[PDB]
Amino acid sequence: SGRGAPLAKVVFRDPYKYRLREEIFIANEGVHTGQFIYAGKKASLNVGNVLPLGSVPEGTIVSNVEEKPGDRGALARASGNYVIIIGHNPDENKTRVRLPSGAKKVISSDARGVIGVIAGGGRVDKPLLKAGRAFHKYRLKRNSWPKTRGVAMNPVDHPHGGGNHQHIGKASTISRGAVSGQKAGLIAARRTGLLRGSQKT
């Protein structure tokens, strides 16, 4: 509930006493029930396996990458998302990875990941036709819907409120140093307007 991607329940075998231990993964595309999932420094390069980043070749696509070895997954957990592996630095024990946002990090080779992409992709390309479908989406997320516009409020309620016409009155761009109660609008904006041109990354 409240999550676009499906989960997967994988049960391994406790290596120190006789019992079974169940673990919640996030399903990658193509993972089906009855499949065997191998996790370790010496597992193979198949979709669904949990390998360290230093143990996979360049160009691999992984998901649920942990940003320090032992955090149990941090970096690609939304539907349809993944991470690419650009390079290795054997001297420093560090790997270069491209994130879903276009950023580039350097994270330890010992950190883990799962091979593939998150299931449930393509979700945000079907319009919500109705206000009632947005109602039920957020009914299992949190209280953030509907949204009233500040410029329709009174001056007691918001920096934008008030006036014989509905208008901001001052630049909507707000200094990063602004204190709480002042930060409404665009915070620490490097530019503004319709984005024309190349990414300019």
Partner RNA sequence: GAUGAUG
Partner RNA sequence: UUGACAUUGUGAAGAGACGUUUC
Partner RNA sequence: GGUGAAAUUCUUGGAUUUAUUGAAGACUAACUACUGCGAAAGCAUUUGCCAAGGACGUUUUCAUUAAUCAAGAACGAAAGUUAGGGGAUCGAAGAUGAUCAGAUACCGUCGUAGUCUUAACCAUAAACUAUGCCGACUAGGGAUCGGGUGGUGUUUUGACCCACUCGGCACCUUACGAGAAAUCAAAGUCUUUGGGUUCUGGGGGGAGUAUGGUCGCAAGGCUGAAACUUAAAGGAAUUG
CB nearer to RNA: pick between 154 and 199 = 199
- Residue 90 as a binder of RNA (CB under 7 A): the answer is no
Interface residue with RNA among 125, 131, 165, 190 (CB under 7 A) is 125
Q: Determine if 196 is a binding residue for RNA (CB under 7 A).
A: yes
Q: Could you tell me the smallest distance in angstroms from the CB atom of residue 198 to RNA?
A: 3
Beta carbon nearer to RNA, 148 or 199 = 199
Residue showing tokens 């690609």: 76
Positions 39 through 78 that interact with RNA (CB under 7 A): none
Shortest reach from residue 41's CB to RNA, in Å:
27
Shortest Å, Cβ 105 to RNA: 15
Q: Smallest distance from the beta carbon of 96 to RNA, in angstroms?
A: 10
- Residue 197 near RNA by CB under 7 A: yes
Which residues form the interface with RNA (CB under 7 A)?
Answer: 125, 177, 196-199
